[PDB]
Ligand binder design. Structure first.
Ligand SMILES: [Ca+2]
Length: 71
RNA sequence: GGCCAAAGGCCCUUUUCAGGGCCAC
């Protein structure tokens, strides 16, 4: 993917990532998975990539829903 | 390079496994 430079898009997309990193599922995710994480393994959406608005948001929707494997 | 995931174009919000607005069709 080809990097994004606009802070008005990066700061916002960074925000959405923190929200998912705030959850207890993400904290129970990193604590149990050491970057050998495959796909199918829910993965943080690439902030620097070239995505449309509805496009990146939709990846966050599925990311946040996907994270909820925990207790 | 290319292919898949995501994706109508943009925006706000911790109603956030969520809610909402305009434009378009
Ligand atoms: Ca699709």
């Amino acid at each position: 993917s080809y990097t994004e430079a606009d802070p008005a898009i990066l700061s916002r997309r960074q925000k959405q990532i923190d929200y998912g990193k705030n959850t207890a599922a993400y904290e129970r995710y990193v604590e149990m998975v050491p970057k050998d994480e495959r796909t199918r393994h829910p993965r943080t959406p690439n902030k620097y990539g070239k995505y449309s608005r509805r496009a990146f948001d939709g990846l966050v929707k599925i990311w946040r829903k996907s994270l909820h494997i925990y207790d």
